Amino acid sequence: MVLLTMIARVADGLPLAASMQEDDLQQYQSQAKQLFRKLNEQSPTRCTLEAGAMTFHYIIEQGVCYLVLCEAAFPKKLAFAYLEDLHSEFDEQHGKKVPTVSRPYSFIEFDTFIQKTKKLYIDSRIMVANIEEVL
Amino acid sequence: TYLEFIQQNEERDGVRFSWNVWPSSRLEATRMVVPVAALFTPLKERPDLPPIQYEPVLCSRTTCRAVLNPLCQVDYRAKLWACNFCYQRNQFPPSYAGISELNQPAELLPQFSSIEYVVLRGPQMPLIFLYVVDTCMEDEDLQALKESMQMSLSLLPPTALVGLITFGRMVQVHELGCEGISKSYVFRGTKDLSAKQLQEMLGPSNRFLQPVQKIDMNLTDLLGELQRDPWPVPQGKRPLRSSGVALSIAVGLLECTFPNTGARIMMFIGGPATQGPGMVVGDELKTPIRSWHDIDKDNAKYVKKGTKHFEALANRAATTGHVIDIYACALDQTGLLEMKCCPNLTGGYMVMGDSFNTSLFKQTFQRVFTKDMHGQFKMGFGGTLEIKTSREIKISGAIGPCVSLNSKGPCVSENEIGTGGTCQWKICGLSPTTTLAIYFEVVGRGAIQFVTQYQHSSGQRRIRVTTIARNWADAQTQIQNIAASFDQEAAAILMARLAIYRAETEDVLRWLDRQLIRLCQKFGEYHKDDPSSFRFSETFSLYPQFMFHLRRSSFLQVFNNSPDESSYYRHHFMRQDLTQSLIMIQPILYAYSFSGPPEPVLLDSSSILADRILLMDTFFQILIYHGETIAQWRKSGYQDMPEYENFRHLLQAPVDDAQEILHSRFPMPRYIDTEHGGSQARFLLSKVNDVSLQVFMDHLKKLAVSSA
Amino acid sequence: EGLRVVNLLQERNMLPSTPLKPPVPNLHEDIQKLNCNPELFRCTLTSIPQTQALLNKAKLPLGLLLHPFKDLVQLPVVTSSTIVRCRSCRTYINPFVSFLDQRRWKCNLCYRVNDVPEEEPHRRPEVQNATIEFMAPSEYMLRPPQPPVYLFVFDVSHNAVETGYLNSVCQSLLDNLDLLPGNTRTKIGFITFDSTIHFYGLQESLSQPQMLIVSDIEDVFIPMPENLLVNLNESKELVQDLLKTLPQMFTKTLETQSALGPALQAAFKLMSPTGGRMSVFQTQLPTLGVGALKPREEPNHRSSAKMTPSTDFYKKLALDCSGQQVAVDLFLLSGQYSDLASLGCISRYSAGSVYYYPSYHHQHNPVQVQKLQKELQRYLTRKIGFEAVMRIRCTKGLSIHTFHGNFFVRSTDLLSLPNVNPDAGYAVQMSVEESLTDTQLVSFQSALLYTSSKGERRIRVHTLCLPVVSTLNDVFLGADVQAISGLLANMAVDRSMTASLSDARDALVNAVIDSLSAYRSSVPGLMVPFSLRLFPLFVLALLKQKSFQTGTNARLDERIFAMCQVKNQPLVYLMLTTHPSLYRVDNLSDEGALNISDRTIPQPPILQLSVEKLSRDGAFLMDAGSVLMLWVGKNCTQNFLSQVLGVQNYASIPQPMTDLPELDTPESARIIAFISWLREQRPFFPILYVIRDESPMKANFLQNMIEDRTESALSYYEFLLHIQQQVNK
Ligand SMILES: [Zn+2]
Ligand SMILES: [Zn+2]
């Protein structure tokens, strides 16, 4: 019911595409930026992480990480039903170019598609671990 | 026969007295067990009925001022009539100088004991309808409200004003007719407003309330593309539904615009009030809407204040003169236990269904605009009931859709029953089915006059007079002659309202029983300390059986229902005529089989015949049953066969025998079709049968003969 | 050139006929060839005092005038993965670094020697370019690049309709809809307000845009979570439809009141989770709600200089707006006093910009209609940056102590500019905190961190290098008279809000007096050096501008807007407004900027701003920067009137002659060419009037002749003597 999606390059950690909206995002988008740096070629291809009131949810495919952060509660097996539709469109439209670019947020225009898919998921109509462990 | 006497007087005067011979003495007055009352139906239909297009005559005594009636004495010679209430002698008016013996005024003929005057004077005011729409529902259940709301306007008269309010988290007062912009004012679904406020915050036709004939094309398209509350609904949570404000804004909207004329506030909720004042339950599904159990065990803190807010919307809307109807259709409980002071105090309706997409609900809605034979609505607005009495009779109270006008007079009783302390009330909306119960007190013949002045759905101001006369009780033969006029049926539905009013406004059954016994001891026959002898007369006989059913009814035995269900059921009871009331307290059972045709049977498990096909008519549901062996040869696919064609009429006689009232009764009742083991036959054995009837009668008899 | 002295009394023709040029700092050739565009960064003193002392006795003021977002021809933009800067001071690698090891570089601001990371290193671009733009990495942003959000807020009150501006605004918005800067993320909104606040939804789901009023002026909110700020791309036809609609919605409103405060507090909430650019359009004193602004009364010519805001509200709101990367632009179109003193404070503290169209009316005043029209085309197609921030670094020993422009100074003197205007100016006063003994060279550099319409973080860094001098006379030799007058104006405007208009007008004389009294005591009549041979003239022009003049019928909103433009317009345009360039355009000859293949374009001598230089038998043109004007001679030649005016005698000219017809005479193409060259030396399209006749009610042309006397002010010769007598006390 409340979000924070991020797509980044698993190598350097360069973020590629995000979606945020407010009406806090400061501390919480940090760890995601520090998680992104940690993730390497041993990191779990799918993994769920846990944090007090919130929760992280990311896959990794073609060498790109599709993280989303949500205030605990929110359906676990449904979160990955978003990022599967995300990774669909990313690898579809932009998959080819992801290791060629280098300006941060080079795929920002992908914000426009996160939102219409983000919401078509809020109104009703794997590995477990703790965040402070990996970081 | 005093039987015909009951039914001729209801037919004509729309009245049903508990006793039609009243106590001639402060001796038997005070010892009147079941009190002196009538169920007064102020707009009962009349076939050969001519409205009286002239002002009604009145008495030239400043305090009296009752209407010329077939009781008052005349003097066709000396142009003079003597009022029967105060014995004044009155000059005849101008129109009444040409009177004759042969050709006497309509008002005085014993046919027009009830009569209807058309006081055509002021220029008629247009009717008003305020749609108050909830957008917090599913697409299937909301789409079928737009359709079914849109139907209503093909039925509404040219000159009537319409207004729309959608609400959810906010409330949107729509300003209508505007082109290429379609605007709406918007308000926090969490701050109540004064009528002044909402006048100032906004500013015969309004921007908001407009003649249908000149916006019926732009209001339909609004409903046409009305869409769901835009705010999203988070997992585990109910929507945010601001019904408390959205009602009091509809209330306050009409308050500052058209105070004191017929207007209908029509609110449709698809779920409870989850925000604002007059809240009903929180936004989390984990905790669920309060039950009666919760309410008795003090686990529902949202109803004590919720009840308050709506109750004050009722008084503020019933004082203004507007009617608040509520059409709740949702699977979960919808908050009708706090909100019921609105349709109840004003004359407004209450309608309950699973989802608005039921054919049940959508028809139950076009029935709100069923016209008479003239193409004019049956509903009326702004009635003012005034009751006048002989110098002996005082008025304890009224139980029913009405509010006090707190007017005083030597005819008001120091005993207040419910809405007591007035001889004037204001029914804020009414139909020819509305029935109050007026309760009187004693302090040659007796006369009561009923004066209702209401707004007709043709905008005409009309006044209805019903003047009645019932004889006092010769003291030589007092108590013997009273037991004759007893109306066992009327008296039970009259006592039944006394009961509900104490329950809804808190034992009860203790008082109900003490009057059953007290009654048995005063009017049936027996020998003390001997139960065997006790027989009642033909006149009373039914009274205990009805009491047996009233005390086990849904209306007193609140549990096994929801608080909404109980408030709903009680609602219709306090407004229905005798006839329909009895159907409520004791369902009416019929019979169908190979042996014997349609014939009513005793509600008892001695009647649950496998052999037979029934038909139980609760006022609120229409059941049809198939026994062991009647369910079996239907699962047999044998119905199909054309040798046994008797099978068919058997399993489509009650169908027709039901569709006939399935399209008459106002809130169209649930239709059922079940058999032994069916999931809903559980109602058949929960109304079929202290304990059961037989045993119940004896505990009564054994106490009927013991200590006074 | 010339070290020479100047006697301002005898010459009196001191001003060049050619446009003045910036002064070239006395700096080694190979260094000066890299110094940045003077129209992008320029000190008041090319030659930098060594001691706070020495500065203190030139009585000239040390400061900088920058114009950082100027639309450039050639802008090198380096995408260096890693960015090399000072490992202390955090300065960016200026070309004025002293390399020493080919492995180490000498920081020219805080004197620390750094290693150049493994990335002919002297001729790398970061060092061959003083005006460079960097591609900031991920560490240089708090959030993903915001999309462009342009919300527009209209006043629709009774007065508002009578003016009729909503018709022009909406046709401008339509004609520049695809030209609005952004990519597929560009968001857009709309709000109107009279006594109530009106939002507009936009879904392709119903036919019509929806109008959602808020009526709780004492407690405002948003009525819909989506479709109030819509994606322009997909929702374009729904936005277009509304713009053909809105001008026709109110044509009969009887609302006299305007709840600006509430409107705006809502307008801020609407966009607050993104920030953007709130375009606000206003027509009268706001009289309803918070932001209530009591009416005031205009001072006539008979008043003594006796400025400030009326309430903190308009400022405190602008701080909030800043904190959320919201910028407010005030389009005032009023015809009566609106307390712009209070209203402007909305664009001042939020990186805004104000636009004033006194007595706007789509009939009664077609001048502003054509001004507002053009200015909007600029405000709408001009490049834009978002959620920008700026820091100005100067070499050790100098200290910046004061800031001028549209922005919010946050801790560590961070110019928080919620938006970066490409035609906005900024200025700064420095002082010598630590004496410049060990140094022969100081450098300044400012960095602009912003977000582009295309959603990419960029940093614009300009760097400037200047010498250090140690004598009074070498301080004067590279004084910058324009830059000094500009700094003095921004300086004086605060002075008039801090104290009094007389106290403002005072330091402005004492800036000349105290300065030349100190140079005369550093060596018969009024001696100045060449570089200051125009300081008394321009400062006169200062005192005579609408911002500072006294004995005039000036109204409050005009003079306030006059100051608002001081603090926010760059240098070149403040100069042009102050001392307009006047041209003899009756007889255009040919010693002119021809070359440009097939054109003409003479450069007739820039004429001094006096009547005696006029001549009633000709026709003269006056460049005010933001507008052009043409005086026409009563007794003029008809040849002119009949071949470029196309009118038989000066008596038959239409009074509001909006612009010359494009006739068919070498004499027409001429004054068309010379006007057009004047138009393309600016992106602001300036309007041109022939209206000046001899009594066509427009004799303001006469208030710019700032050398002549009045019933109200001195003459330039008169001003010269007040100086001398006070130089020689
Ligand atoms: Zn009387
Ligand atoms: Zn450094």
Swiss-Prot record, chain A:
Keywords in alphabetical order: Acetylation, Coiled coil, Endoplasmic reticulum, ER-Golgi transport, Golgi apparatus, Membrane, Phosphoprotein, Protein transport, Transmembrane, Transmembrane helix, Transport
Single GO molecular function: SNAP receptor activity
Topological relation to the membrane, as annotated: Single-pass type IV membrane protein
Locations listed in the record: Endoplasmic reticulum membrane; Endoplasmic reticulum-Golgi intermediate compartment membrane; Golgi apparatus, cis-Golgi network membrane; Golgi apparatus, trans-Golgi network membrane
N6-acetyllysine: residues bearing it: 33
Sequence ranges on the Cytoplasmic membrane side: 2-135
Primary residence: endoplasmic reticulum
Keyword RNA-binding: no
GO BP of this protein: endoplasmic reticulum to Golgi vesicle-mediated transport; negative regulation of autophagosome assembly; positive regulation of protein catabolic process; protein transport; retrograde vesicle-mediated transport, Golgi to endoplasmic reticulum
Gene Ontology terms: cellular component: endoplasmic reticulum membrane; endoplasmic reticulum-Golgi intermediate compartment; endoplasmic reticulum-Golgi intermediate compartment membrane; ER to Golgi transport vesicle membrane; Golgi membrane; melanosome; phagocytic vesicle membrane; transport vesicle
Domain of life, per lineage: Eukaryota
The keyword Phosphoprotein appears for this protein: yes
Domain Longin: 6-114
Assembly and interaction partners: Interacts with STX17. Component of two distinct SNARE complexes consisting of STX5, GOSR2/BOS1, BET1 and SEC22B or STX18, USE1L, BNIP1/SEC20L and SEC22B. YKT6 can probably replace SEC22B in either complex. Interacts with the COPII Sec23/24 complex composed of SEC23A and SEC24A; recruits SEC22B into COPII-coated vesicles to allow its transport from the endoplasmic reticulum to the Golgi. Interacts with BET1.
Family label: Belongs to the synaptobrevin family.
Free-text function comment from the UniProt entry: SNARE involved in targeting and fusion of ER-derived transport vesicles with the Golgi complex as well as Golgi-derived retrograde transport vesicles with the ER.
Name of the protein in its database record: Vesicle-trafficking protein SEC22b
Organism the protein comes from: Homo sapiens (Human)
Swiss-Prot record, chain B:
Main location: membrane
GO biological process: COPII-coated vesicle cargo loading; intracellular protein transport; protein localization to plasma membrane
Location within or outside the cell: Cytoplasmic vesicle, COPII-coated vesicle membrane; Endoplasmic reticulum membrane; Cytoplasm, Cytosol
Membrane topology of the entry: Peripheral membrane protein
UniProt xrefs under Pfam families: Gelsolin, Sec23_BS, Sec23_helical, Sec23_trunk, zf-Sec23_Sec24
Keywords assigned: Acetylation, Cytoplasm, Cytoplasmic vesicle, Disease variant, Endoplasmic reticulum, ER-Golgi transport, Membrane, Metal-binding, Phosphoprotein, Protein transport, Transport, Zinc
GO MF term set: GTPase activator activity; zinc ion binding
Keyword rRNA-binding on entry: no
Any one GO cellular component localisation term in the record: perinuclear region of cytoplasm
Residues at which Zn(2+) binds: 59, 64, 83, 86
CDD domains, sorted: Sec23-like, Sec23_C
InterPro entries per the UniProt record, alphabetical: ADF-H/Gelsolin-like_dom_sf, Gelsolin-like_dom, Gelsolin-like_dom_sf, Sec23, Sec23/24_helical_dom, Sec23/24_helical_dom_sf, Sec23/24_trunk_dom, Sec23_24_beta_S
Gelsolin-like repeats: 598-684
Positions of modified residues (Phosphothreonine): 287
Nucleotide-binding in keyword set: no
Function statement: Component of the coat protein complex II (COPII) which promotes the formation of transport vesicles from the endoplasmic reticulum (ER). The coat has two main functions, the physical deformation of the endoplasmic reticulum membrane into vesicles and the selection of cargo molecules for their transport to the Golgi complex. Required for the translocation of insulin-induced glucose transporter SLC2A4/GLUT4 to the cell membrane.
UniProt record similarity statement: Belongs to the SEC23/SEC24 family. SEC23 subfamily.
UniProt domain comment: The Gelsolin-like repeat mediates interaction with proteins containing PPP motifs that include MIA2, MIA3 but also SEC31A. These interactions are probably competitive.
Disease: Craniolenticulosutural dysplasia: Autosomal recessive syndrome characterized by late-closing fontanels, sutural cataracts, facial dysmorphisms and skeletal defects.
Name of this protein: Protein transport protein Sec23A
Organism of origin: Homo sapiens
Curated annotation (Swiss-Prot), chain C:
Membrane protein topology class: Peripheral membrane protein
Membrane keyword on record: yes
GO cellular component: COPII vesicle coat; cytosol; endoplasmic reticulum exit site; endoplasmic reticulum membrane; ER to Golgi transport vesicle membrane
Binding annotation for Zn(2+): 86, 89, 107, 110
Keyword set includes Secreted: no
Subcellular location: Cytoplasmic vesicle, COPII-coated vesicle membrane; Endoplasmic reticulum membrane; Cytoplasm, Cytosol
Gelsolin-like repeat placement: 602-674
Keywords: Cytoplasm, Cytoplasmic vesicle, Endoplasmic reticulum, ER-Golgi transport, Membrane, Metal-binding, Protein transport, Transport, Zinc
Region (Zinc finger-like): 86-110
Gene Ontology annotations of biological process type: cholesterol homeostasis; COPII-coated vesicle cargo loading; endoplasmic reticulum to Golgi vesicle-mediated transport; intracellular protein transport; positive regulation of protein secretion; regulation of cholesterol transport
GO terms of molecular function: SNARE binding; zinc ion binding
Protein name: Protein transport protein Sec24A
Organism: Homo sapiens
